Design a protein around this ligand. Structure first.
Ligand SMILES: CCCCCCCCCCOc1cccc(C(=O)Nc2ccc([N+](=O)[O-])cc2C(=O)O)c1
Ligand SMILES: CCCCCCCCCCOc1cccc(C(=O)Nc2ccc([N+](=O)[O-])cc2C(=O)O)c1
Ligand SMILES: CCCCCCCCCCOc1cccc(C(=O)Nc2ccc([N+](=O)[O-])cc2C(=O)O)c1
Lengths: 206, 208
């Protein structure tokens, strides 16, 4: 049972260049691939999909999301944003807050969008917290876990990275201790339901 | 060096499978795994690698009784990483003297995991920082800093993690330290992984 999938969505630009197009074209084809992946995970009973946009441009990606929130909501998806948003324009932060509040009771897919996120950041913000307080000796795995992102959700079972690099690139680190790692050369805009099922297979086989 | 790789970490898996394949008990897998350790350490010493970090896993320090003399003679700085405050005092003392012995060595740092976990690793660095806060700032805690307190903070960053044995995961080996590392998975079982395979891996970090 694959319950929580995380995807490093790499290769929009390599895709654009390969097609003879401007970067913005690859970004738009990548956004179609995000809708396909969301729909596919939600229809296949996955509980959580966590998406990391890799290849500033970070606020622009979350803006594009803003205008799909109604559809996520109608589709019973709970939306969470993970990452450092505290230096984001404040109108965007309030939009994040509204969109998360709007879908927070939704019972389908949990979609976490990693925006200005780093695995090291994530842990170092949990380490900020505990230290702002109890005794050194009492801090342990179960407790550090309590602070890092997504601790309330099913453990990450599978990490897919498209685009052909073999690295985490500072995406989830704490959370991936035990996850299947699946690397495909397929570039993000080409990654489709059949490639996604390919990765669920590799996990089912384990 | 052409490969351009400074620090390699290996999840040494598949000793058990290798044994079953030949109709032998797990013990023969470990023996052949031990030979393959020796072969790896050597390869790394003679190719300009500066740190080599080995994680024993199947999907033991005591005969450091007997290999540590050689490590020292090749100028290898031997370091044991993981939670050994758990181990009997004779053992801890053997580790202590093997580390004290080679600590001013200047060639390969060879780091051998022993009761090591990547989350544990992070958990302890945290505690060095919490102690430090209690003796008098949180706001100051940055990635550079926690990063100063996780194991191996003083070696070159991990460039390349090799996992032999066919599984695709980290299995709670290095987690902070592999944020940027190249990840190389091979179906070759640990006891068969040889100099060419290790060449294959390095030529993959370089060609990539
Ligand atoms: C910068 C990237 C832009 C972000 C776009 C991402 C927004 C996600 C679009 C939401 O569309 C959703 C969302 C959640 C679920 C679904 C969804 O399940 N849709 C479907 C469900 C079933 C089926 N089906 O084959 O029967 C199809 C879909 C579907 O929408 O295609 C669609
Ligand atoms: C030719 C040279 C031969 C090279 C052999 C060197 C490889 C030996 C690696 C030693 O690995 C060890 C040694 C002692 C303990 C462990 C170890 O993992 N012990 C554990 C102890 C307690 C617990 N626990 O939380 O209950 C877990 C472990 C554990 O991680 O499995 C690993
Ligand atoms: C906690 C205990 C630590 C686990 C011990 C790990 C075993 C390490 C084995 C040491 O063997 C080494 C170490 C470093 C270098 C070499 C090495 O250079 N080996 C050789 C290279 C060439 C040649 N040669 O035919 O000329 C021979 C050797 C050789 O050492 O046998 C061997």
């Amino acid at each position: 049972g694959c319950r929580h999938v995380a995807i490093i969505m790499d290769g929009n630009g390599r895709w654009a260049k390969k097609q003879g197009k401007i970067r913005a074209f690859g970004h738009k084809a990548g956004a179609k691939s995000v809708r396909r992946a969301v729909s596919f995970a939600a229809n296949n009973g996955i509980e959580a999909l966590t998406l990391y946009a890799f290849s500033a441009l970070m606020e622009l990606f979350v803006w594009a999301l803003d205008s799909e929130v109604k559809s996520l909501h109608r589709h019973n998806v709970r939306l969470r944003i993970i990452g450092d948003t505290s230096r984001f324009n404040s109108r965007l932060q309030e939009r994040i807050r509204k969109s998360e509040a709007l879908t927070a009771g939704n019972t389908g897919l949990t979609l976490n969008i990693a925006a200005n996120y780093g695995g090291r950041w994530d842990i170092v913000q949990g380490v900020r917290q505990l230290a702002e307080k109890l005794q050194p000796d009492q801090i342990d795995e179960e407790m550090l876990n309590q602070h890092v992102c997504m601790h309330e959700l099913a453990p990450v079972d599978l990490v897919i990275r498209t685009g052909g690099e073999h690295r985490i690139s500072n995406f989830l680190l704490w959370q991936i201790a035990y996850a299947e790692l699946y690397f495909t050369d397929v570039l993000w805009p080409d990654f489709d339901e059949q490639d996604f099922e390919g990765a669920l297979n590799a996990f089912a086989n384990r």
